[PDB]
């Protein structure tokens, strides 16, 4: 599967993209959406919520499965992708683009060290 070289990743099959203001945009990977199948619901976090790294904060549900989506870093949820409430299949068709799930302002920069680069995420995929 497609593993964009510029992104960061979690072992739970999330990606993170740093934006110009320093916030991160978070979604699930091409591999993740492929395994879940045809998406029917994305339960979004509350804007303004404070989360710790590893907290469950969204859910992706398909016709066959559902999975928790974890905060990859600690911080405040600053935006959510409201389009997924009516078009959850964007997660399937454009997991790195229109299928983004939420944006987070990180509270502890040190946590970024626990994130994977693209090479490590590819290796992880090759390791299932």
């Amino acid at each position: 599967s497609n593993v964009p070289a510029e992104l960061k990743y979690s072992k739970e099959h999330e990606w993170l993209r740093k934006e110009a203001d320093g916030t991160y945009t978070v979604g699930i990977t091409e591999h993740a959406q492929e395994l879940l199948g045809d998406m029917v619901f994305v339960d979004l976090p509350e804007v303004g919520a404070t989360v710790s790294a590893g907290d469950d904060c969204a859910v992706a549900e398909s016709v066959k499965a559902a999975s928790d989506i974890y905060a990859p870093v600690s911080g405040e949820i600053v935006a959510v992708n409201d389009a997924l409430s009516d078009s959850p299949e964007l997660v399937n068709s454009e997991p790195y683009a229109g299928g983004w799930i939420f944006k987070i302002k990180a509270s502890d920069e040190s946590e970024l060290e626990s994130l994977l680069d693209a090479t490590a995420y590819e290796a992880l995929l090759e390791d299932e």
Side-chain angles (χ1 to χ4, degrees):
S1 55
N2 180 23
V3 178
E6 303 160 2
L7 302 176
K8 306 292 190 173
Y9 297 86
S10 82
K11 294 174 263 308
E12 298 293 14
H13 309 284
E14 295 163 55
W15 55 268
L16 300 88
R17 187 179 65 222
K18 196 179 194 195
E19 303 294 335
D21 65 1
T23 61
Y24 289 87
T25 302
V26 181
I28 69 175
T29 64
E30 170 67 25
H31 184 246
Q33 69 74 31
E34 190 63 59
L35 278 170
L36 287 165
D38 195 352
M39 217 61 63
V40 302
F41 169 60
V42 180
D43 194 7
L44 293 172
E46 238 134 71
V47 172
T50 299
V51 294
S52 289
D55 285 353
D56 38 316
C57 69
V59 174
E61 177 185 15
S62 70
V63 290
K64 65 182 191 195
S67 183
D68 284 340
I69 296 172
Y70 298 103
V73 296
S74 306
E76 181 191 359
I77 304 300
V78 298
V80 299
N81 188 351
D82 293 306
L84 297 185
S85 297
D86 293 345
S87 302
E89 60 273 10
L90 293 167
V91 177
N92 299 123
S93 59
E94 45 187 305
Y96 300 115
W100 70 279
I101 303 173
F102 64 90
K103 295 168 188 286
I104 188 161
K105 180 175 169 9
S107 60
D108 182 356
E109 234 92 292
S110 72
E111 289 176 341
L112 322 167
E113 289 173 8
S114 294
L115 306 180
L116 290 194
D117 81 356
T119 304
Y121 187 68
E122 294 172 329
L124 184 78
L125 293 191
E126 284 169 21
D127 193 25
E128 25 169 280

